[PDB]
């Protein structure tokens, strides 16, 4: 089972998200083209319509924040987690919180946000991961550039499975 364990529902359909602070590592307009490029893989495969504003409220807040910020967890320093991401609703939740201790670059065996985000804009949804040894759900990272990017017959299925 690919899904999210547990009633994972947002109820809501037309989906809007503000990049809330922009990283040093990579600059704005890279970001938010990284972040464009991760939300629409999913349209490709979703009846749900995700636009972004510039005013009012992000349905999915991503922010780029590092230590004990709130929500109790912590991001951890360079390494280890990438993100924190929550699982789909209103309110706080609905998210994905990025590491900004992380040092996140576009080049090919550095730090990649557009394969963390697509990933992460799928456990907000419901996803959990995925167990088919060619999966971007998978547990394992392999890099696959941004543009020749595809998600694989496991991960289609997940998303389907959830939202057919
Ligand atoms: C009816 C008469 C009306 C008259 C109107 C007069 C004109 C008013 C114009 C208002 C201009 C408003 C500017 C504006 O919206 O700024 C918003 C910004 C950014 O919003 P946003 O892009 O979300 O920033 C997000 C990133 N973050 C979290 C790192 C800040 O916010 C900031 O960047 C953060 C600012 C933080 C200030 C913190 C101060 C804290 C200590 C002081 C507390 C005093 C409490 C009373
Ligand atoms: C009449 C009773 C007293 C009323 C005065 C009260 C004090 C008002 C304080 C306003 C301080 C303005 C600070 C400022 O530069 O705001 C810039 C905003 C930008 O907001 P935003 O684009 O959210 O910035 C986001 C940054 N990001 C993406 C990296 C997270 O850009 C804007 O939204 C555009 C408008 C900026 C200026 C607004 C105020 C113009 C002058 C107000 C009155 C001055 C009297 C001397
Ligand atoms: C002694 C105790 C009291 C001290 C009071 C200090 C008041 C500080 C006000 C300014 C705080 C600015 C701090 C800061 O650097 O924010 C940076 C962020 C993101 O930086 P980041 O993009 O993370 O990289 C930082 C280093 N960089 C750019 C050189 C590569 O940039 C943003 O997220 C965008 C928001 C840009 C706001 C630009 C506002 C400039 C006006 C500052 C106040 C002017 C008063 C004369
Ligand atoms: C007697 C009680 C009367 C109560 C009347 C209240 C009526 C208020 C009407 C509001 C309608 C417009 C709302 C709207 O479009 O808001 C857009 C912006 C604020 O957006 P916001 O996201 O806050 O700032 C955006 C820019 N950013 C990100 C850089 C900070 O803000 C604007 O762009 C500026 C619009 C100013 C609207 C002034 C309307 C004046 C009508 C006054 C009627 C008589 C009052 C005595
Ligand atoms: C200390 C700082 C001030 C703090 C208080 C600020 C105000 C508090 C209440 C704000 C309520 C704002 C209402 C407002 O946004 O109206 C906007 C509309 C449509 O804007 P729209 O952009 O469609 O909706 C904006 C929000 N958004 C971006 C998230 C989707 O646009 C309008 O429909 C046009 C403007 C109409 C104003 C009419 C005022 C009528 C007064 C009549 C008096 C009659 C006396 C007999
Ligand atoms: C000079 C500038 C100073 C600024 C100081 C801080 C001012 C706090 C402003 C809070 C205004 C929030 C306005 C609001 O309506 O936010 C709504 C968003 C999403 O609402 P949403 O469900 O999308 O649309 C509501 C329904 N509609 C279409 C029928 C209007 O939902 C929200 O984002 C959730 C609500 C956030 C509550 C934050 C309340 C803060 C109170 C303490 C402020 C202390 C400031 C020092
Ligand atoms: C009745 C009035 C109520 C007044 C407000 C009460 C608020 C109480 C709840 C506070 C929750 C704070 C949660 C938290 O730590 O948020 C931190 C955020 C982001 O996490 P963080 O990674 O720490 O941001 C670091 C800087 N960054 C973006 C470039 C990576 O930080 C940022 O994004 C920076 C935002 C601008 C901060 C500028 C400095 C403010 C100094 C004064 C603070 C006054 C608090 C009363
Ligand atoms: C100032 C006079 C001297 C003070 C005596 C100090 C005595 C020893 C105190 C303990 C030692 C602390 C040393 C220190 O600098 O700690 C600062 C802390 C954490 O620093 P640090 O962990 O490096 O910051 C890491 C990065 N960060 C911000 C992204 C989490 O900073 C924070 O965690 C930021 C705190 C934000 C509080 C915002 C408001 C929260 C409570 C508001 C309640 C409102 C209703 C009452
Ligand atoms: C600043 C700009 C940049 C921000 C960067 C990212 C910063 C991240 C901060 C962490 C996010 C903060 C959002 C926040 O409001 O969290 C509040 C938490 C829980 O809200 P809650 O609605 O319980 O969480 C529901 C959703 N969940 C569990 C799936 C996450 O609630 C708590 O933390 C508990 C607070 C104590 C509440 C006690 C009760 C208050 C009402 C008491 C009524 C008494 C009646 C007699
Ligand atoms: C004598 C006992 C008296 C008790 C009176 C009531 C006390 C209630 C507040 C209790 C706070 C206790 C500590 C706590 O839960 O902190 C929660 C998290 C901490 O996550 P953590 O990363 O550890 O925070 C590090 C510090 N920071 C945020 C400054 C970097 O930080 C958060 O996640 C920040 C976001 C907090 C949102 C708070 C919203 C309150 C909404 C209330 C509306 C109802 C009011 C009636
Ligand atoms: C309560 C009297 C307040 C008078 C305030 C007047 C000024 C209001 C300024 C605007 C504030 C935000 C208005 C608002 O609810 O906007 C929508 C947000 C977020 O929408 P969304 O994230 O879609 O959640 C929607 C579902 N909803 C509304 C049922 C929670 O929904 C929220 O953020 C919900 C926030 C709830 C705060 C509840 C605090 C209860 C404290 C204990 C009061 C005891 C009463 C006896
Ligand atoms: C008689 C009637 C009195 C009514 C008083 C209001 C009573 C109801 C208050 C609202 C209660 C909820 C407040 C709260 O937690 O706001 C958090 C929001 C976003 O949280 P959200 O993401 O909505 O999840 C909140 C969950 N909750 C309520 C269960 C804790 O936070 C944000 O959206 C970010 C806001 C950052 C504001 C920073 C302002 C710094 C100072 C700015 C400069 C001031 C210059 C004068
Ligand atoms: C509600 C009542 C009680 C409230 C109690 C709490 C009050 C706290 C007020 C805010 C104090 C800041 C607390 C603190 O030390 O947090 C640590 C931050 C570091 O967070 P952040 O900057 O994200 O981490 C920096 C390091 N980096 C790039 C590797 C991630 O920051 C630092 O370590 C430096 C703190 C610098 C303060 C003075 C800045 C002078 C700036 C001069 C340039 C602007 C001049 C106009
Ligand atoms: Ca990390
Ligand atoms: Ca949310
Ligand atoms: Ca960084
Ligand atoms: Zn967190
Ligand atoms: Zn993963």
């Not at 636009?51 to 910020?69: C, E, P, Q, W, Y």
């Not at 946000?113 to 998978?138: C, E, N, Q, R, Y």
């Amino acid at each position: 089972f690919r899904e999210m364990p547990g009633g994972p529902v947002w109820r809501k359909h037309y989906i809007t998200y503000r990049i809330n602070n922009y990283t040093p590592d990579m600059n704005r307009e890279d970001v938010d083209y990284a972040i464009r490029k991760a939300f629409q893989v999913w349209s490709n495969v979703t009846p749900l319509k995700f636009s972004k504003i510039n005013t009012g409220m992000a349905d999915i807040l991503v922010v780029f924040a590092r230590g004990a910020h709130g929500d109790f967890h912590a991001f951890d320093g360079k390494g280890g987690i990438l993100a924190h991401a929550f699982g789909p609703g209103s309110g706080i939740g609905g998210d994905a919180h990025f590491d900004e201790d992380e040092f996140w670059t576009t080049h090919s065996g550095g730090t990649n946000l557009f394969l963390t985000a697509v990933h992460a804009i799928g456990h907000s949804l419901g996803l959990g991961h995925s167990s088919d040894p060619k999966a971007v759900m998978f547990p394992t990272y392999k890099y696959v550039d941004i543009n020749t990017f595809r998600l694989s017959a496991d991960d289609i299925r997940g998303i389907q499975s959830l939202y057919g």
